C-alpha cells in the first residue's frame, strides 16, 4: 500500500501462551468448515480449516499434534448463510503449557462445541459487525495459542 | 448501498442485547474517561478521539446514579495507542454489567478500574487499532463494543 | 505501528507536484461546494462530510484569486450518494490543473463545472463510497485525491 | 450481512452495462499475462495473484480470436507492486473496447500495450493495492475493474 505489495488484514489475539510449530494460513473470503480434534482430559489438539476463496472452497494446511489420542470433530457450515458470529474458550495450563483448553463455534444458526476442556480463563470474541476470515497460531502436543483475522 | 462507511465492530462484553449509546468511528483515541465504584461496576464512559489529527470529544455517557470515581486516562497519541482491553462482566443487583476495565498501551497498563470479579474478557489486538465505542449505560456500564479499523 | 486509521487513497489526477489541503477520512458526503470559470479551471472546494450521523463542516479551501462561480451540491445523505467522479485535467497559464468536476450519484449528475477540454480522467465506484478529499488550491486546483473506503 | 468478505472495487472501464469474469481478490500480485494488437485493442488477460505469500492462478480469460502478442508483466513481489493503471477505451468494430493498458510500479512501467487511442483513463494509488481484476472478454477487453485494498 504504501510499504509492501502485501495486503493487511485486523488480526485479533493470541489467545493461550504468549511468546510448538507455529502456522499461518493467513486471510481468505469466508470460511466453510472447521475440522478440530480435542481430548476431555487435556486441551484442542489438530486444527484445520477448509476456507472460502472467492466462492470456491481453498482447503487449508492441517496443523498436526505432536501425540495422538485426539477426537476429531468435522463443523460443516451452510455457507455462505452460516457465519461464525463468535469464537470463545478457555487457556490454561496443561503438563506446565499454557495451551488452548477448549473451543466453541457460534454461528447465527446454532453453536458447535464446546470442544475440549473448559477449564482455566474463558476468552471470548463476538463479532457484531464483520468476518473471520483467517486464522494463526501454533499447535506442539497442543493448541498452544491462536489468533483470528477479521475483515468486513 | 448505505451510504455510509462501514467498520469491524467486536463484541458486545456484558449483557446479551439502560441507555445506549454508539459513538461511531473515528482516526483514533487520545483520551477516555471513564468513572467507576470498587463496590459495584464501570460508570460514566466519554471519549476524546482523534479525528483526521485534530482532537474530537466524544458524548459523555452517564451513568444514572452518581458516587463513582473519575479517572482520566491520557494517551499520548499517536505514539502510544491501545493494544489490548480486558476486564470483567458479573451481575450486580441482578443485572450483568462491566464490573472493570482495564487499558493496556504499547507504553503501559490503565487499571484495572473497577471490581476484579465475575466473568474475564480480553481483547489483544495484534494488527490494527481501536476507534471507537458503543453500548449501554444504565446504573452501570451494561455492555460495550469497539470499532476496529486498520 | 502508527496510532493512526489507514484508508485507501486513489489519486492525484492533476499536477503530478498553491496550498495543499487534507481533509482526511469520515463515514460520507452530505454537501460538496465548490467553485469554477468557464475559461480557465476549478477554484474553490469545501465539503460538508457526514461523521457517524451527523455533518462535519470540512474547512474552506479557497483560491488565492476571485472571479469564479459558485456552485452547491446538496445530496440526499444517506440514500444518495456519489457513484463515479469525473473531469479534466490541463494547462492554465502553465500550470496543470484540474479544469473541470462533475458528480454521478446514484439518483443525479451535477456538473460538469469549468472547462471540459484537456486529458479526461474518471472514477466509478462499482463497490465503496468516498469519504474524504485531499489536494492543493492555488490559482486553481491543482490536484486531488479520493478517499474510499467500504 | 453474507458469510462472504468484500472489497472497494473501482470500475468499470470501457463498455458500459463477451465472457464475463471474476478473479476476486487476493492478498497481491506477482505477474500479469496479457495480450494485444496494435491494431485493434487488449484481447488475452491473466493473472498470478499472491495468495498468504504463495502464487496462485488465476485463470486464463482468452479473447474469442487470435492473431495477438503476448508479454509476460513479471513482477519483483513483493518488493514491487502496480501503482498505476492507464489506457485507453474506444469503439472497435463497433463495440467500446478496452483498447490499451500501462501498468506503472514503483520500480518500472510496463507498456503500453495496445492502441493508445480513445478516451483515456487512468487510477493512481496514492495508498493501498489492487489485489483483483473482474471484466469481460469478447473479441476484445470489453472492460474492466480492480479490487482495491489496504
Redesign the interface.
Known amino acids: ?2 510499504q ?12 493461550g501462551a504468549q511468546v510448538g510449530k507455529a502456522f ?8 466453510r468448515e472447521i475440522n478440530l480434534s480435542y481430548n476431555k482430559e487435556t486441551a484442542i489438539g489438530d486444527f484445520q480449516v477448509i476456507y ?4 470456491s472452497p481453498f482447503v487449508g494446511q492441517n496443523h498436526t499434534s505432536f501425540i495422538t489420542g485426539f477426537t476429531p470433530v468435522k463443523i460443516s ?1 451452510d ?5 461464525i458470529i463468535e469464537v470463545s474458550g478457555h487457556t490454561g495450563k496443561v503438563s506446565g503449557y499454557v495451551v488452548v483448553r477448549s473451543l466453541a463455534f457460534k454461528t447465527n444458526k446454532k453453536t458447535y462445541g464446546p470442544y475440549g476442556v473448559t477449564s482455566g ?11 473471520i ?2 486464522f494463526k497460531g501454533s499447535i506442539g502436543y497442543w493448541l498452544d495459542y491462536f ?1 483470528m483475522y ?3
Open positions: 500500500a504504501e509492501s505489495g502485501k495486503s493487511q488484514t485486523v488480526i485479533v489475539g493470541p489467545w499461518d494460513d493467513g486471510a481468505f473470503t469466508g470460511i472460502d476463496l472467492n466462492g457450515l455457507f455462505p448463510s452460516e457465519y480463563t474463558p476468552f471470548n470474541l463476538p463479532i457484531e459487525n464483520g468476518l476470515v483467517g489468533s477479521l475483515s468486513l
